[PDB]
Design a protein around this ligand. Structure first.
Ligand SMILES: *[C@H](c1ccc(Cl)c(Cl)c1)[C@H]1SC(=S)N(NS(=O)(=O)c2cccs2)C1=O
Length: 554
C-alpha cells in the first residue's frame, strides 16, 4: 500500500519560521560562515512528501517468521503494568503541544480537573472503540544544518505526525512500561538504548575484537518510517501482547494500534485534511520501540538469508550496524547484496547500498564512529565521536536564538571525550554562561529522545559517571579524527583549535575564581588547556530505552 495519500492541502506552520542564522556577535565568534547555517521550514515540505510517498510491496519468508517466533518467546517473559493518570501526566513535557480541547501541558502536569476528565474520556473511548481512526496533526520539523555543496541541495524538512495531547497521555498509561522494558528483553545486547556512550564503544570494540577476521557495515534504510507497513505495526502489537498485561492494557494497546499506529487521517495546523497515512507516525510513544523491533527483526532475518557468519547486530531505531566474520572481499560484497535483497523484500530498501568495512573506526553507526586516544599515562582509550559540522551549526544557532532545544549541552554530554566538544563547545558556552551569570540556569536537552533538565555546572560529575576520568585527560587523538575536525573548522569558518586554547585558559581562570561546582568545572573541563596539569581525582535511567518522538519528560 501507499505510505501516504495526499489531498493537495498544504503542510502549514503554526508560527513564524526562522530559516537563516542571524548576524549575532556571540555566534560569529564561534562560526563566521553564517550563510552556511540554515533551518528547515514548511516551505520544503513538498519535497519531503515526494520522497516519503511510495508503494510498499512487502513479502515475508521463513527466516522472517523464525526470528519473529523467537522474539515473541522472549516477550512472553515480560510483565508490564499500566501507568496511573497521575504518573502519565508527570511524564508530560512542560511545553508539550496543548490539546485542542481547551487544556495544555501545564494543566496536564498540574492535574487540572478539566485535563484529567478529558484524559479519562479519551481512555474510555479507546476501550469502547477499537476501529475509528484517531486524528493526527502533520507538521514540518524545524531543524538546523550546514549547507552541503556536494549534495547539490539543502535538506527538506522532516515531517512529524502526532495525535492530540489527551491521546498522548493515554499512550503513556497503556505503553510506557512496555516500551521502557520490553525492548532490552527481546533484543538482548543488540538493543542500543541500554548503553551509555562508553558502554556502546565497549560493546563495539569487544564485538569487533571477538571476530577472527572482522567485517562490519551500517545499513541505511531509505525513509524507514515510510517503509514500515501496517503489517509491521500489527506484528509489533502481537509482540506487545505476548507480555503479561492487565485486561484494559491489552484493549488499549489493540485500540491504539488499530486506530492510531497503523495509520489514520492527517490534518494540517489550519485544520484542513492533508490526506491519509498507512505507515509509522514519527510522533507517537511507540515510534522508537516499534522501529527498533522492526529493524532488528528484518535485519536478523536478512542476516540468515545472506548466511553471514557469527553476526552481531547493534540497533537503535532505524539505525543498524552489523559486525561479522569476513569470507573474503568479493564474498563479503556478494553477501551484502543478498542482505540488501532480503531487507528490500521485507519492505526496507537501502538509501545508500551497504559497504563492507574492515576498519572499525570507518564504520558510522548512529551518526558516530569509534576512535582512539590516550589518557595521562599513555593508555589507549576508545571513545565515540562524529563529524562536528551539525553540532557546531546547531551550537551557533542556539547561541544567537532562544530555543527550547539545547543540543549543545547534549552534545557536550554524549561526546565529552572528543577534542571538538572539549576545546570548542565547552570553551564557547562556559564563556557565555559566565558573561550572562547563567552558570546556574538549568537547561532542557534530549537524551535518547527523552527530555531532561540539566545544570551546566554538573557537567564534570556527569561526564565522569558516563565516560570516566579519562575524558578530562585524553590526548594524542588519531590523525583521521584530527583532520576531520580541522577540515570542518575551515569549512565553517570556526577559529582554529589554537585560538580556542587561549580562550579556554581565560575561561578556566574565571571559573576557578568562583565557588563550588564552578571551580570544579574550571579544574576538570579545562585541564587540557594548561601545561601545569592539576590532579584530577574522583569528584566528591538516562540509558535504558529510546523515546524519540515519544513526548517524554524525565
Ligand atoms: C544515534 C546515537 C546512538 C547512540 C549514541 Cl551513544 C549516540 Cl552518541 C548517538 C542517535 S539515537 C538518538 S535518540 N540520538 N540522540 S542522543 O543519542 O540522545 C544524543 C543527544 C545529544 C547528542 S547525541 C542519536 O544521536
Amino acid at each position: 500500500s501507499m505510505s501516504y495519500t495526499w489531498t493537495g492541502a498544504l503542510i502549514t506552520p503554526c508560527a513564524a519560521e526562522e530559516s537563516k542564522l542571524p548576524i549575532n556577535a556571540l555566534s560569529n565568534s564561534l562560526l563566521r560562515h553564517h550563510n552556511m547555517v540554515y533551518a528547515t521550514t514548511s516551505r520544503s515540505a513538498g519535497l519531503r512528501q515526494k520522497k516519503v510517498t511510495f508503494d510498499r510491496l512487502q513479502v515475508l519468508d521463513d527466516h522472517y517468521r523464525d526470528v519473529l517466533k523467537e522474539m515473541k518467546a522472549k516477550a512472553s517473559t515480560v510483565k508490564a503494568k499500566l501507568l496511573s493518570v497521575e504518573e502519565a501526566c508527570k511524564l508530560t513535557p512542560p511545553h508539550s503541544a496543548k490539546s485542542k480541547f481547551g487544556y495544555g501541558a501545564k494543566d496536564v502536569r498540574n492535574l487540572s480537573s478539566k485535563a484529567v476528565n478529558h484524559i479519562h474520556s479519551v481512555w474510555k473511548d479507546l476501550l469502547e472503540d477499537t476501529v475509528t481512526p484517531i486524528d493526527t496533526t502533520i507538521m514540518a520539523k524545524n531543524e538546523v544544518f550546514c549547507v552541503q555543496p556536494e549534495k547539490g541541495g539543502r535538506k527538506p524538512a522532516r515531517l512529524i505526525v502526532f495525535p492530540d495531547l489527551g491521546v498522548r497521555v493515554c499512550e503513556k498509561m497503556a505503553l510506557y512500561d512496555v516500551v521502557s522494558t520490553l525492548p532490552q528483553v527481546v533484543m538482548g545486547s543488540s538493543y542500543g538504548f541500554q548503553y551509555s556512550p562508553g558502554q556502546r564503544v565497549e560493546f563495539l570494540v569487544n564485538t569487533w575484537k571477538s571476530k577472527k577476521n572482522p567485517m562490519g557495515f551500517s545499513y541505511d534504510t531509505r525513509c524507514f518510517d515510510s517503509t514500515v507497513t501496517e503489517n509491521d505495526i500489527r506484528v509489533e502489537e502481537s509482540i506487545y501482547q505476548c507480555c503479561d498485561l492487565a485486561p484494559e492494557a491489552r484493549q488499549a494497546i489493540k485500540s491504539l494500534t488499530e486506530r492510531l499506529y497503523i495509520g489514520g487521517p492527517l490534518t494540517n495546523s489550519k485544520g484542513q485534511n492533508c490526506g491519509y497515512r498507512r505507515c509509522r507516525a514519527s510522533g507517537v510513544l511507540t515510534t522508537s520501540c516499534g522501529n527498533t523491533l522492526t529493524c532488528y527483526l528484518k535485519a536478523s532475518a536478512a542476516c540468515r538469508a545472506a548466511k553471514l557468519q557469527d553476526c552481531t547486530m547493534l540497533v537503535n531505531g532505524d539505525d543498524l550496524v552489523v559486525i561479522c566474520e569476513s569470507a573474503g572481499t568479493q564474498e563479503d560484497a556478494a553477501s551484502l547484496r543478498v542482505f540488501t535483497e532480503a531487507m528490500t523484500r521485507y519492505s526496507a530498501p537501502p538509501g545508500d547500498p551497504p559497504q563492507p568495512e574492515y576498519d572499525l573506526e570507518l564504520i558510522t553507526s548512529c551518526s558516530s564512529n569509534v576512535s582512539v586516544a590516550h589518557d595521562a599515562s599513555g593508555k589507549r582509550v576508545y571513545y565515540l565521536t562524529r563529524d562536528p559540522t551539525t553540532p557546531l551549526a546547531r551550537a551557533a544557532w542556539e547561541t544567537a536564538r532562544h530555543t527550547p532545544v539545547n543540543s549543545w549541552l547534549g552534545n557536550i554530554i554524549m561526546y565529552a571525550p572528543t577534542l571538538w566538544a572539549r576545546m570548542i563547545l565547552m570553551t564557547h558556552f562556559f564563556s557565555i554562561l559566565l558573561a550572562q551569570e547563567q552558570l546556574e540556569k538549568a537547561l532542557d536537552c534530549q537524551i535518547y529522545g527523552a527530555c531532561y533538565s540539566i545544570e551546566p555546572l554538573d557537567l564534570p560529575q556527569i561526564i565522569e559517571r558516563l565516560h570516566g576520568l579519562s575524558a578530562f585527560s585524553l590526548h594524542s587523538y588519531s590523525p583521521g579524527e584530527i583532520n576531520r575536525v580541522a577540515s570542518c573548522l575551515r569549512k565553517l569558518g570556526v577559529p582554529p583549535l589554537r585560538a580556542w586554547r587561549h580562550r579556554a585558559r581565560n575561561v578556566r581562570a574565571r571559573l576557578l575564581s568562583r565557588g563550588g561546582r564552578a571551580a570544579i568545572c574550571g579544574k576538570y573541563l579545562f585541564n587540557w588547556a594548561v601545561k601545569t596539569k592539576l590532579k584530577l581525582t574522583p569528584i566528591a535511567s538516562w540509558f535504558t530505552a529510546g523515546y524519540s518522538g515519544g513526548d517524554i519528560y524525565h
